[PDB]
């Protein structure tokens, strides 16, 4: 009963970071060797576990979150980080136990003339809590005057696009991120190495 990580890492379509996807992985045997030994990743930072000893561990559940951000935003996908992605789009808790995996996806997610389908949240009345997902599209009041759900001066749509083009600098190129959460509860473990 192999854990279907291939559904997550090799999915054809990835979500925008503001509407990030989550797959709950239970009752299976995971082989993390196929990932950390893989050379396809530009980022593979783990927290609370040593990545090279992952197969010797056992967790209640494992969560795979995936989305697209741009290259210079990958550093924000870590505990304690700040910025519009970490504060308004995807937040990790301080006590995070898991791994953050990313790789350049310029060929899949950039388009001639720009790919404007990937969005991020630019405005919010408060920071996200850890693992919070906000898909609202309410007009944001940035100034003195209320907006009444319509765009006006200092009344902005809260989402913005990247516009990925293949010729972009690598820091502005799209990156696909998978965040594995290793959940340990007071319950029988259901996801283990081989």
């Amino acid at each position, epitope marked *: 009963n192999l854990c279907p990580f291939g559904e997550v890492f090799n999915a054809t379509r990835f979500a925008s970071v503001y509407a990030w996807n989550r797959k709950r992985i239970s009752n299976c045997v995971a082989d993390y060797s196929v990932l950390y030994n893989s050379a396809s990743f530009s980022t593979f930072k783990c927290y609370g576990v040593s990545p090279t000893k992952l197969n010797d561990l056992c967790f209640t559940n494992v969560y795979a979150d995936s989305f697209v951000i741009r290259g210079d935003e990958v550093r924000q996908i870590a505990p304690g980080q700040t910025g519009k992605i970490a504060d308004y789009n995807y937040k990790l808790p301080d006590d995070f136990t898991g791994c953050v995996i990313a790789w350049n996806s310029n060929n899949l997610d950039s388009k001639v003339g720009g790919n404007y389908n990937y969005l991020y949240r630019l405005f919010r009345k408060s920071n996200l809590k850890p693992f919070e997902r906000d898909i609202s599209t309410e007009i944001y009041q940035a100034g003195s005057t209320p907006c009444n759900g319509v765009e006006g001066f200092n009344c902005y749509f809260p989402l*913005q696009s990247y516009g990925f083009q293949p010729t972009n600098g690598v820091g502005y190129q799209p990156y696909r991120v998978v965040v594995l959460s290793f959940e340990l509860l007071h319950a029988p473990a259901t996801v283990c190495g081989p």
Partner: antibody
Amino acid sequence: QVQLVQSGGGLIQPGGSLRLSCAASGFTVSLSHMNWVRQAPGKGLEWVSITYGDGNSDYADSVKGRFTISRDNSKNTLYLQMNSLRAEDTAVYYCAREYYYGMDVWGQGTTVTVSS
Amino acid sequence: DIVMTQSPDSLAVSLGERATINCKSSQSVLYSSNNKNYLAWYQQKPGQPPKLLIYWASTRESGVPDRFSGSGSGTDFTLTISSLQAEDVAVYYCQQYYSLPLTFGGGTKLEIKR
């Protein structure tokens, strides 16, 4: 990388019309607020118009009834249609994004000379 | 309209010395609820568009050298260059983004004193 590239403009007679264009990359115009700002030779900056994400616009009194903004979403381009031009409209015309804390990115500018 | 008034119109500062530009708004641009001054400073050099230097009266845009700083609140604001460089010779504008119409100051020309 947010970027604005301007096009159009040039020489026109009083009463004529010109169409200025402003193409954006790195962000979506129809998700942002965009300004037109003009600067007469040797003078300061004068705000001309603002265009919100829905396509509606607000104008300064000095150009209302004569200037109109249209947009091409697929081309991510904003257009300033200037009709009934006068010599006092001679200026360099900029497009600039109304970020929530100011005009953060500007086009390179377009010279408009109204003269007979 | 909110009228922006800069002073002086021209300022001459020796290289390596401190430059101070003032901007005044006819009414306050201080939003009571978030305590933010809706005021920005721009630097314009000939043939170029203006460049954002300071916003929220005192927040530096990324990439602006440390010698640039902004101060003030309500109706009176100030832009300070701690140590003048030859590259800082330009025209500087204030601008309120509190209410329409958006208005700039008349501009302050910064030059080298000899």
